[PDB]
A = this chain, B = another copy of it.
Amino acid sequence: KRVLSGRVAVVTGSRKGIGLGIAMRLAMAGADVVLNGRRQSPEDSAIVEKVAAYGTRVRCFAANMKDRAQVEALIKFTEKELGAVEILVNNAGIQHVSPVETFPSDKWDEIIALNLTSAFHATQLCLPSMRQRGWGRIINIASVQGLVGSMNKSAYCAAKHGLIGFTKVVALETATTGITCNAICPGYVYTPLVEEQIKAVAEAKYGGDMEAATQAFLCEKQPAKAFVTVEQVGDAAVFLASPGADMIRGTTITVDGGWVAQ
């Protein structure tokens, strides 16, 4: 009795934050959801209850998306519990603010592996089932940082640009099938990833004042002067997964409050 009823979806990362909203909105649309995260159980029970409040099957998994073996384990676990993976949301990623000169190479490697190559592993593993079933959705959670650059985020911007290019290529390789591949480019969304940066800014320039730090953080980049919600990103993902997006391929849905428009 719902648009996504019976669909099995897999969110690869960000159990808290954007991944949470995406999972909630996919479950609201009737899809079973598997939430993957790099954490074990801080508040994961509350997250799973929030997702399962919509009466769909919900599962929780802990795979390091930098390890292809663990990505394959995640896919096979989803197949065992729910069924063939039909909606792959690649949302893993981290952030590290640093100028290029002092940017650690290990952090560059970590950001590339988690924000770019994990999507490659997950897509490579899930595409055969989607092709055999004749249907599939691959939604990559890119960033506005994948369309433009920001200071001291070289690795993140590179990985996000790369994830957009990968989206284009995958969409082209599947253009004639019922499988569509697209990307979402959110602006600032209040998440632990963004909360950490806000706290750093507050302690650096604003005497530890989180309110002023948040104000400056948004006013720098987002003309709307307000955060994008995880619910809105989830709505964008639901739209991309719906039949109306059957011919939406290789493009970007940007939810940024005007960040990129300027």
Chain A positions near chain B (C-beta within 8 angstroms):
68, 99-101, 103, 105, 108-109, 112, 116-117, 120-121, 123-124, 127-128, 131, 145-146, 148-155, 157-173, 175-176, 187, 222-229, 231-232, 235-236, 238-239, 242-251, 253-258, 260-262
- Interchain CB contact (< 8 A) of A120 among B100, B121, B224, B226: B100
Least CB distance from A188 to B in Å reads 10
Number of copies: 4
Minimum-distance CB pairs A-B, first 4: A149-B168, A235-B244, A250-B261, A161-B165
Known: A100-B170, A154-B170, A253-B253. 6 other contacts (CB 8 A): A101-B128, A101-B131, A105-B124, A168-B261, A176-B223, A235-B245
Q: Which residue of B lies closest to A124 (CB)?
A: B100
Least CB distance from A147 to B in Å reads 9
For the complex, give the distance between the alpha carbons of A175 and B247 in Å.
29
Tell me which of A109, A225, A239 has the highest count of chain B C-beta atoms within 10 A of its own C-beta: A239
